[PDB]
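Dataset card, provenance and construction

Sequences and ligand SMILES were collected as paired inputs. For each pair, a complete structure of the chain with the small molecule in place was predicted and serialized as structure tokens. The example below shows a pair involving CB4. Curators did not alter the output after generation; any descriptive sentences attached to a record were derived from the structure itself.
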Amino acid sequence: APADRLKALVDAAVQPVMKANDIPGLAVAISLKGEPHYFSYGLASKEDGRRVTPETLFEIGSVSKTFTATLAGYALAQDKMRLDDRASQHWPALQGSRFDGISLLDLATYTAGGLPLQFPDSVQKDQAQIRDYYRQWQPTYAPGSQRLYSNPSIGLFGYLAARSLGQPFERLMEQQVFPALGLEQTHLDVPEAALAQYAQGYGKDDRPLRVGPGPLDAEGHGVKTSAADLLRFVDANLHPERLDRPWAQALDATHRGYYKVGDMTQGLGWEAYDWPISLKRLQAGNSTPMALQPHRIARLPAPQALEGQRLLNKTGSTNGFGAYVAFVPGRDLGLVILANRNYPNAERVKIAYAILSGLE
Ligand SMILES: *[B]([O])([O])[C][N]C(=O)/C(=N\OC([C])([C])C([O])=O)C1=[C]SC([N])=N1
């Protein structure tokens, strides 16, 4: 009966949303009382009929920002940086720029003063172009005052965290972060040997979309992973105390809230809500206006532990993929939903809410 009930719950949440949003393939992984459960639907590739499994690799887009925050958490644990550091401390090219007056915390939490959602099209994946872009950039409003969700903002945070550790970002992620977290199916650059597991992404007219190069792409949206590996990452987040101590501290650093916008408390990578909370409020926290417009923050007098009766989440999108991760620290509950269409955040949250409500 119990395995039948869980399958019925997840099928009832997933199947209508896959039909309504024409999602070719979707992987669910659930962590329930320390036990993993996997549900795989549809096709990783429509053209060759490859089915989704818990080992299928998906682009997770901005869920990558929780990995970037974890690497920064490692630099903080090693005393190589502090969140109150001026950004220009970690990159001499930025000395004399407005980054002399912007903190690593501002970059991590999208409050540097109006860094845009994307690098402009004029900035290619080129060290000199990225350097020159930040050197010339000027805030629209006071650093620390307004949240504007931004790839160049947390991209620079990750890039400077890597500089504080004296190694390239991509090398630190591959050689230290993924191995420390026990992740062997998690990649910034998918090996040839794993390419057969890499799902196709689907956009308009089912145009095929796997992400190409972009400025600070690894830091912003670089990760490809399986549902089973991303659930291992969720399980590390639910139990940081099981990791070697520097990595436990690295994960804990991502569970600290700095300010509120509406119902949402902003951490490093993770965004948190009180739990329980209505489905409409969790949808509103993950809405297009939340992501695309500036919002005045309500700064907390001291950082808040993101634990207990809270849901931590992150959405992630690329042109061809739509990911969502949520976990409830106080209930030892974790959920991963990976799809190979970029379908609306509201619909990702509808699946997640049905499952998390039904596990309770
Ligand atoms: B992360 O995945 O949130 C970063 N997202 C982006 O770079 C893109 N869109 O941002 C919004 C609209 C806020 C979103 O909901 O994801 C993005 C990159 S490629 C594409 N079609 N969208």
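Derived descriptions for this record:
The first helix runs from residue 2 to 20.
The first strand starts at residue 25 and ends at 32.
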